[PDB]
């Protein structure tokens, strides 16, 4: 009846004021959440953002990360104080049909992330081991056994294995930056919140600073990782009777989460400066993983003789594909954990980790093998580009499931009927939190129409455009109705 019954309140190791060892104990949840923010689903969009705007967008990254650190922390609080996840809170404060709508929506979000991870991992196999594109996918389907071995390890070593992947993809991209020797002064100048990123005048590669910036801000959080954080934050036993120990617990999970999401921010920065210093200006014409592989393997694309010799040897591209693999392993862990959370929390369905990863991976790979089937039927022409367009079109479910995850979180944590007058949010995080939630909801409701119109490709059929407008209006209005309904129920609780 409690979230993550297998590992809930497992190891509590606060030992007086020995703070840093205590920090070493529970440092896992923050890493498990942060590794999701390093998925390849936006890698290109960083590199592109670097080529179109050298170091300019870095600040935006920071801001985004900060916002992601805010809401995530809030989720952790809801897990630490209430001893229950966000899905159990929402489902407890609303009917079953709304918990079922939220269930299918979040299932579609983690399914989209899973599509990104299976595409990036399969392509990673096509690049490293030269496995055929169709075989690499059905090889990625075999991650259920890696989940079986994953199940016997334990969170003290699982949550450190996630750290291992994090520093794998962090040192892979940091190594290619170390060889690049970039002008770190311009990097520092880019990290400052300037007003050149909010303008619309450069328009390089069909992208203005305000468009790229608002895109980075819009994709700030992932809805599944909020439920994830609220569930894994409970894995540390708390008496819930000593205010100093629960306040300490909040400081604990906060410093952990910021320590890891800061690493994710560093990875995004390494991708932007990867697009600025490593690649030449405008050398990246194919945002696909294969386009970045050959672009990292062509000496004329880099801007340094050392990177030309190393690229001719073929080490940059291979490291890139290794990073693709290490990123593609995340959805096997966090996808199953979060899927269990939303499942047994929203619809009260107890399912094992076997059929979970089976069903999610199959539903994820169906459109992938359909895309590879059509493109390989066209002669393997534009197959990687179509895989990239599938990966980017999948991300609409995140925008569909975002407000129903950030609004109920902010409401339930701001109310004293869930946190109490002692552990509710400060008047500071009330303003910052409501501002961020409004901005993200507006931006994603804007993104719905753009992605739905993007489903029809770059060929604008005049009759299909109006249909995309009708479908977009219907979807955003339906999300408005669901949003005001959830607002009404939660505010009836408070």
Author numbering: 13 to 506
Paper text:
conserved and function as secondary active transporters. transport proteins that include the amino acid transporter LeuT18.
mutants of Glu129 and reduced to half in H236A. different role in proton-coupled metal ion transport. residual H+ transport that may have escaped our detection.
